[PDB]
Amino acid sequence: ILQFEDILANTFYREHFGMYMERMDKRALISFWESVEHLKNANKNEIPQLVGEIYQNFFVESKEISVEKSLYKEIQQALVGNKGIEVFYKIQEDVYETLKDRYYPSFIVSDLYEKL
Ligand SMILES: [Zn+2]
């Protein structure tokens, strides 16, 4: 019996969850979670590109993540180099709880979960 942690940890399972999110027309939430998981495990030399891609694909070219304005300053301050990339790790925890509480319960009754 798979749980949400098992879904995200297996790449096959996670691709099926992402397909579900595209059917819910909200694949930017899993994509942003996937981007910060890359940044968390990446070589130090790809970090600059990865951070700029996170702030452009999300927060600029798309506007689907829910931070509003309080933490948005922290993002800009991490892009310039004052603060660190820990702001993205906290936003990833908030997006994880969102996927877990309001999208995973719908996912476990779809065939993208039940046939795994
Ligand atoms: Zn990499």
Author numbering: 449 to 564
Paste lines from the article.
The N-terminal membrane anchor mediates localisation to the endoplasmic reticulum (ER), and the proteins typically localise to sites of new lipid droplet synthesis and can enhance membrane tethering of the ER to other membrane compartments via their PX domains including the vacuole in yeast, the plasma membrane in Drosophila and endolysosomal compartments in mammalian cells. The precise function of the SNX-RGS proteins is still unclear although their mutation or depletion has significant impacts on cellular physiology, particularly with respect to lipid homeostasis and endolysosomal function.
We next investigated how similar the experimentally determined SNX25 RGS domain was to the predicted structure from the AlphaFold2 database. Side chain conformations in general were likewise closely aligned between the experimental and predicted structures. The predicted structures of the human SNX13 and SNX14 RGS domains from the AlphaFold2 database are generally similar to the experimental SNX25 RGS domain structure as expected, but with some notable differences.
